[PDB]
Structure formats: structure tokens, C-alpha cells
From a paper:
The retinoblastoma tumor suppressor (Rb) is a multifunctional protein that primarily regulates the cell cycle but also has roles in cellular differentiation, DNA damage response, and apoptosis. Essential functions of Rb occur through its pocket domain, which is necessary for regulating binding interactions with E2F transcription factors and transcription repressors that bind via an LxCxE motif. The pocket domain is the most highly conserved region of the multidomain protein, as well as the most frequent site of mutations. Protein X-ray crystallography of four missense variants reveals how mutations destabilize the protein fold and inhibit E2FTD or LxCxE binding.
Residue numbers in the entry: 383 to 437, 440 to 499, 512 to 576, 600 to 611, 642 to 784
Write the structure that this text describes.
Amino acid sequence: QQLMMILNSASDQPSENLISYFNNCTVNPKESILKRVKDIGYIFKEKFAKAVGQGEIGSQRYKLGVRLYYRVMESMLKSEEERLSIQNFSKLLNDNIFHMSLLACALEVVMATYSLSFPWILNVLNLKAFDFYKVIESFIKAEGNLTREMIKHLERCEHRIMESLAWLSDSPLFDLIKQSHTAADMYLEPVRKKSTSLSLFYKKVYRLAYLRLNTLCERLLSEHPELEHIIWTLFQHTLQNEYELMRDRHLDQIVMCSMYGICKVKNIDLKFKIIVTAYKDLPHAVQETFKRVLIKEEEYDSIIVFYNSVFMQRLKTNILQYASTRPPTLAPIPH
């Protein structure tokens, strides 16, 4: 609301102080940035009508999105001016996935405001969930006027990428796993060392998955406060070394298996029944997560079918280590 009148009263072309940044650049990005709005102007409007019948509206959504895009870019560039060398500043300003991700974020804000949302806009712009993820926090941090409900919504996009969308096949997340700080830092990362993107994503995933584990242990496993850290160590040893199981799957399916699992090898016998019912009570939870779980070659079954097939089949060598004389040393709980 307070933001939405900034946009309509403002103009659809870059500010005059934003354009300075374009011209302090060693390669002026402007015509490329500007061809970029126009080329996406076609594609967006096209796919817009392809889902909403017909009315003209597509263009107004976009032309607001664009004003937000420039307002946030201008605000983002002000901070990165001090952080980046002139070389990085100019590479940023010509990086396609950067600018695409920033605009995809602007557009999601307006579309959601006037509510076919997330991850709709990623399919429209042929933008990998994991690339787009990198712009979300510095975007929230770069628009003061985002409303609670809007901030809360971008955060839920972030949590859906961390929980599933970044774990689908052809997602660059797996390319980065095999090999082994702001949005610019992550877009400037070369595809060719450290990888700040993968690091921040994993640190964030762990805090997410761990808060979801922690509530679920306070309902069903309050009896043994000690079972939590064990279940967490299992999940964390799973995400780090058997990460291939999250492909085309959902973070919460691994949280659930790590819980029945540790109650299985300690003879606690609080079975999948209570787990799924209590999980329904997690915010935004969907029943499909446990009723519909992949095994292999597109064949889906229930969560108990997954536990006894791929999860147990991959982890028996490790899980029994927990109830033995020498159980593995504990993982740290995320800060």
C-alpha cells in the first residue's frame, strides 16, 4: 500500500541517479538492461494472458514491477557501490541472471499484492529456482516499505525453494554440490573455488529443517528430550553425504524419516501414524508431502513406502551405528 503508491506516481524508466551508476560503469549496461525489460515485456504479457483468459492488465502489472525493479536496483547498487570493485560493480550490472532474478522478484511482489503465483513467475522467465533464491534477502533488505504480508510472502518463497524447488533435477544446486554476503556476491560467483552460494543455502536449509524437526520433537518425543539431537545428527549426516535423496523430493520427508528411524533403532515405536498427523499441524503443511513420495523413474508411493525402500536401503550401514556400542559423534545444532 505505502509502496504501491510510490510506484504508480513514479516513472517506468530508470531514475537519473540510478543512471549515473550505469555511467560510472566501465561497460555501460543500460541498453542491455533496457533491451532486457522490453524482451521480457513480450514474454511476460504473453504468458499472462495464457492463464487469465483476456481483458491489457498484463502490461500494467509489468510496468509497476519495472518501477519497483529500478527502485530496488538503485537502492541495492548504493550498498554494493561500497563493497564491489569497479570491475565487480560493472559485471553485476551486466549479469543476466542477476537482473532477471531482481525483476522476477519485483514482479512477484506486485502479482502477489494483486491476488497462479509463485513459482509461476519462475516458469514464465525460465529462471532456475536456485538462481532466484539468491536475490530474495537482499531484496527484502533493500525495500523498507515491504509490508509484513509481503515480507512474509517472499520469505515463504525462499522456504519453498530451500524445501523443494532447489532440489528438483536440472537445478544448479546439484552441480554445485558435486564440486565441493549479498545477492551480488552470489551472482558474481563464477560457474568455473569457495562457493558462497552453496554455503549460505546449506546454512539456511539447516536452520529451516531444524526448526521443523524441533517443534515435531516437542509434540511426539517430549518423553525423551534426548532423541532430538540424535534425530538431527541423522538428518544432517543425510543432507551432507546422501544428498542425492532430496532430488525431486521435499525437505520435510527427510525430517519425518529421520524421526521414525531413530525411534525404530531405540525401540521407541512411536510410528509413522503419529508423525504424519502431527505434521499436518505444521504451518503451510500439505498432505501430499507424505501421501505422494517418489521412489524411482517417476513411480510415486506413500511415505512408509519411501522409508522402507530408498531411505532404509541407503542408510542401514549408518542408522544401526546409532544403537551400537560406538554411536557417531553429534552434529552441531544451527545457530
